[PDB]
Write a protein that binds this DNA or RNA. Sequence first.
DNA 1: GGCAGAGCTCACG
DNA 2: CGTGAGCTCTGC
Lengths: 350, 347
Amino acid sequence: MKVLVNHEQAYNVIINAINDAKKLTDYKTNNQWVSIQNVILGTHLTYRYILITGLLAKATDPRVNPLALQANAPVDGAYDARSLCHSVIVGKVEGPFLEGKLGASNEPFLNKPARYMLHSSDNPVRRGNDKVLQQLSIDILHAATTQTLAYEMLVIALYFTLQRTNRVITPNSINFDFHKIIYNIISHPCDGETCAIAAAISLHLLGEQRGWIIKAHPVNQAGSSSKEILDIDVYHDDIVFLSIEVKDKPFNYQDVNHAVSKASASGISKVIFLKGPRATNLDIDESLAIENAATKGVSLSFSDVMTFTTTCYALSPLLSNDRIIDFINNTLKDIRAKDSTIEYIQSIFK
Amino acid sequence: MKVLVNHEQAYNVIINAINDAKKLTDYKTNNQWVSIQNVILGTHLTYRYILITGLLAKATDPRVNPLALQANAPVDGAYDARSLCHSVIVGKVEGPFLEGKLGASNEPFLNKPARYMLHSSDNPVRRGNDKVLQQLSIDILHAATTQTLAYEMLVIALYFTLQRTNRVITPNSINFDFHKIIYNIISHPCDGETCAIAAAISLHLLGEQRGWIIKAHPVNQAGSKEILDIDVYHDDIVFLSIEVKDKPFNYQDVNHAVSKASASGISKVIFLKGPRATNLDIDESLAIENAATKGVSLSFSDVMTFTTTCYALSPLLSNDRIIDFINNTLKDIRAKDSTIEYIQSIF
DNA sequence: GGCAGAGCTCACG
DNA sequence: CGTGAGCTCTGC
Ligand SMILES: [Ca+2]
Ligand SMILES: [Ca+2]
Ligand SMILES: [Ca+2]
Ligand SMILES: [Ca+2]
Ligand SMILES: [Cl-]
Ligand SMILES: [Cl-]
Ligand code: NA
């Protein structure tokens, strides 16, 4: 029998749970607390939302099955977990009460791990820590057999949520030099985010004085979105005059043509195609790609990410290290960088 | 159990199928043709790529199960259809031979309908017309029981693909092809002087509205207010010096350039490598680490990468004055008579 | 020549 | 009310 969870009640329940978490002293009351700590403080965004939503639902309505994700799941107490998460947690709670400390995802239940009828170990999962966190979060929800236990675990979960850090790099280093920072940032792929960050902060060095507005987008935002042309779009006088495609994996001529075509369809006449350290083994005829782009009205050029950063640095006026850190921090917020990216970059400044 | 579909064979099969489709006289020879028509002309992009790929795999390799989408599917003849579609259809075929008429997707097998082990009616789908197309594409693949039947249906599917329209409007060509200009300038080395010209005019394009002063110098003379081959001024101060090498060189030439910039208080040096700057022993990272201890940010770049990066960062307005940039550079580097001639033979 | 998932905007019925 | 299509990103 499917269930309708009352969204006004779930809102009141999670407000009370947050106020309790803000005064919580003994978080070791329930024996799921280590599992809850590891999921909430982990780097997997979607399992945080799934865990909070399941516990909230069961704390609000004892009829629900906390392992159900969709209303038509073939279990008793199935419910539409996506709508509870997006309307209450995303729409009303995480911003004002949690400072985006779950990750500030707009639609976490469209992420692949949430697009299932049940939160289940049958659901395919990336190997390694993601598979471990999948089982931990299943175990917690499976342990939430009463409203009271679910509420107890919800408070512990939000207590650990409130401990999470933001997307801010604090430079403990007295001073770093730009080239060494870039070199360490792009040595690890970090889901494609580090090469995009290196490209973005390099544009900031040259755009600072010319009034450029650099818009780097979340790397998992799709080219079909109206919110972007390519990976990074550069505005002067409210108009995109240059777009950048970054590749930190191997690419072929069709990848290039796909980016050129998106720029051509939006009337952007200059494109830079940047090859990160993993864009290797590429016998690709760049002059033919550039010729093809030219007929489509796009001026296309190529560069390694490292060469692009050192050339931007050499051409720019030198600004305080404080200003470079600002570029990094603003870019990390703009692309809603992942936890592992934040931790990796923070470790560079230590 | 998984089988491997040979991608090079699959390419030959679909090229043959496309040529057969382009001359097909009778598309009604297989009783799936109406279902094939409705899938290929339908509005569900991922079923189009699933259909084509599965028919391609079975036509290529008789061991395949055309309903398998993933190599680890628990059926005989499972295979990695994602990699077949992306490396053959997307990578090499749809654009050049089908005009993007499947949809011109770059990663269709990341689309949700493809992210299952098997193509089956268990998989999530919208009610209505998508539900029907799902069942039709399953039925076609289910009927592709032999190589011969799979090929025939593939040819029919491509025939209907060719009937779709891919309404993209062909823009006009770029007004200003900078890459061509630079390629033409540096195709002849002219004793390393065309590389200096290419680098200098790119700096002019970028600095015209930034208040830079570009001072290029004769490229094969170490004459004393000049630093390296090109000095860039902002506020009467050199902030960047460029050496333009279009012949072999070693780290003594690099350390010499770094030392002169250091001695003048220049902390940024670019070393440009022309097309003829070949047979290089240099550990570039070691040269860079040494220059840092002398207080110099050193970096390396191809002439072509550097010039086109400057242009990409430039305003479009600078393009009117490019011939002025070339003419001023020719004078400043005291170009040889044969160099002025080669440059004028282009503009 | 290995295989396939975590995230995201934009929807449909 | 309920939830899929299509598209980004290399990870393991
Ligand atoms: Ca399974
Ligand atoms: Ca992108
Ligand atoms: Ca990219
Ligand atoms: Ca034109
Ligand atoms: Cl966070
Ligand atoms: Cl839907
Ligand atoms: Na020289």
